[PDB]
Amino acid sequence: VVERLTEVIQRVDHAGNRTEEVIPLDNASASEIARVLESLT
Amino acid sequence: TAPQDIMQSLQSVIEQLDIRRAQVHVEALIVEVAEGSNINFGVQWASKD
């Protein structure tokens, strides 16, 4: 029974995986796009 | 000095305001032709008393 809850959690611990990435911007200003994309949500 | 968006605007303005100017050669011509004349003819007398 512990086996599953090593299974469940460390499978569920995958589900909420949150990683960050830097996307460059060749034309638009990053400060605009940061206001626009944050006005949606 | 501006953000990446405003810059790309101000580069297309400066590119279009940087054009080569033409120069002009302005001649004036001031002409004047004058022609005068006059004529004067008359007799006069005098005498004693």
mmCIF file with all atom_site columns, C-alpha atoms in Angstrom, chain A:
data_model
loop_
_atom_site.group_PDB
_atom_site.id
_atom_site.type_symbol
_atom_site.label_atom_id
_atom_site.label_alt_id
_atom_site.label_comp_id
_atom_site.label_asym_id
_atom_site.label_entity_id
_atom_site.label_seq_id
_atom_site.pdbx_PDB_ins_code
_atom_site.Cartn_x
_atom_site.Cartn_y
_atom_site.Cartn_z
_atom_site.occupancy
_atom_site.B_iso_or_equiv
_atom_site.pdbx_formal_charge
_atom_site.auth_seq_id
_atom_site.auth_comp_id
_atom_site.auth_asym_id
_atom_site.auth_atom_id
_atom_site.pdbx_PDB_model_num
ATOM 1  C CA . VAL A 1 1  ? 0.000  0.000  0.000   1.00 0.00 ? 1  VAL A CA 1
ATOM 2  C CA . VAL A 1 2  ? 2.937  2.324  0.603   1.00 0.00 ? 2  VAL A CA 1
ATOM 3  C CA . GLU A 1 3  ? 4.137  1.256  -2.851  1.00 0.00 ? 3  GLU A CA 1
ATOM 4  C CA . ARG A 1 4  ? 1.151  2.929  -4.514  1.00 0.00 ? 4  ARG A CA 1
ATOM 5  C CA . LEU A 1 5  ? 1.602  6.076  -2.465  1.00 0.00 ? 5  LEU A CA 1
ATOM 6  C CA . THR A 1 6  ? 5.183  6.210  -3.633  1.00 0.00 ? 6  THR A CA 1
ATOM 7  C CA . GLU A 1 7  ? 3.575  5.574  -7.028  1.00 0.00 ? 7  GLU A CA 1
ATOM 8  C CA . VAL A 1 8  ? 0.657  8.004  -6.686  1.00 0.00 ? 8  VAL A CA 1
ATOM 9  C CA . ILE A 1 9  ? 2.467  10.992 -5.214  1.00 0.00 ? 9  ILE A CA 1
ATOM 10 C CA . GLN A 1 10 ? 5.614  10.871 -7.333  1.00 0.00 ? 10 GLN A CA 1
ATOM 11 C CA . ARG A 1 11 ? 3.310  10.473 -10.323 1.00 0.00 ? 11 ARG A CA 1
ATOM 12 C CA . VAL A 1 12 ? 1.068  13.262 -9.004  1.00 0.00 ? 12 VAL A CA 1
ATOM 13 C CA . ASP A 1 13 ? 4.179  15.260 -8.100  1.00 0.00 ? 13 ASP A CA 1
ATOM 14 C CA . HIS A 1 14 ? 4.806  15.157 -11.853 1.00 0.00 ? 14 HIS A CA 1
ATOM 15 C CA . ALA A 1 15 ? 1.391  16.645 -12.618 1.00 0.00 ? 15 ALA A CA 1
ATOM 16 C CA . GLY A 1 16 ? 2.003  19.999 -10.965 1.00 0.00 ? 16 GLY A CA 1
ATOM 17 C CA . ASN A 1 17 ? 5.481  20.354 -12.440 1.00 0.00 ? 17 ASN A CA 1
ATOM 18 C CA . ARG A 1 18 ? 6.305  24.038 -12.945 1.00 0.00 ? 18 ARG A CA 1
ATOM 19 C CA . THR A 1 19 ? 9.386  25.072 -14.934 1.00 0.00 ? 19 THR A CA 1
ATOM 20 C CA . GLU A 1 20 ? 10.417 28.466 -16.291 1.00 0.00 ? 20 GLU A CA 1
ATOM 21 C CA . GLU A 1 21 ? 11.870 29.535 -19.612 1.00 0.00 ? 21 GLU A CA 1
ATOM 22 C CA . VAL A 1 22 ? 13.147 32.742 -21.186 1.00 0.00 ? 22 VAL A CA 1
ATOM 23 C CA . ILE A 1 23 ? 11.636 33.538 -24.591 1.00 0.00 ? 23 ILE A CA 1
ATOM 24 C CA . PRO A 1 24 ? 13.493 36.328 -26.427 1.00 0.00 ? 24 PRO A CA 1
ATOM 25 C CA . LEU A 1 25 ? 11.690 39.066 -28.334 1.00 0.00 ? 25 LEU A CA 1
ATOM 26 C CA . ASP A 1 26 ? 13.180 40.410 -31.548 1.00 0.00 ? 26 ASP A CA 1
ATOM 27 C CA . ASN A 1 27 ? 10.647 43.137 -32.360 1.00 0.00 ? 27 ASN A CA 1
ATOM 28 C CA . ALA A 1 28 ? 8.109  43.985 -29.663 1.00 0.00 ? 28 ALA A CA 1
ATOM 29 C CA . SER A 1 29 ? 9.082  45.345 -26.279 1.00 0.00 ? 29 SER A CA 1
ATOM 30 C CA . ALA A 1 30 ? 9.025  42.777 -23.519 1.00 0.00 ? 30 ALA A CA 1
ATOM 31 C CA . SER A 1 31 ? 7.379  45.274 -21.181 1.00 0.00 ? 31 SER A CA 1
ATOM 32 C CA . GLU A 1 32 ? 4.294  45.658 -23.382 1.00 0.00 ? 32 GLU A CA 1
ATOM 33 C CA . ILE A 1 33 ? 3.861  41.911 -23.892 1.00 0.00 ? 33 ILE A CA 1
ATOM 34 C CA . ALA A 1 34 ? 4.135  41.531 -20.129 1.00 0.00 ? 34 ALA A CA 1
ATOM 35 C CA . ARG A 1 35 ? 1.182  43.865 -19.605 1.00 0.00 ? 35 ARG A CA 1
ATOM 36 C CA . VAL A 1 36 ? -0.910 42.459 -22.450 1.00 0.00 ? 36 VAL A CA 1
ATOM 37 C CA . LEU A 1 37 ? -0.435 38.785 -21.628 1.00 0.00 ? 37 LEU A CA 1
ATOM 38 C CA . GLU A 1 38 ? -1.164 39.558 -17.976 1.00 0.00 ? 38 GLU A CA 1
ATOM 39 C CA . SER A 1 39 ? -4.330 41.475 -18.824 1.00 0.00 ? 39 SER A CA 1
ATOM 40 C CA . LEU A 1 40 ? -5.857 38.235 -20.108 1.00 0.00 ? 40 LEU A CA 1
ATOM 41 C CA . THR A 1 41 ? -5.430 36.481 -16.773 1.00 0.00 ? 41 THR A CA 1
#
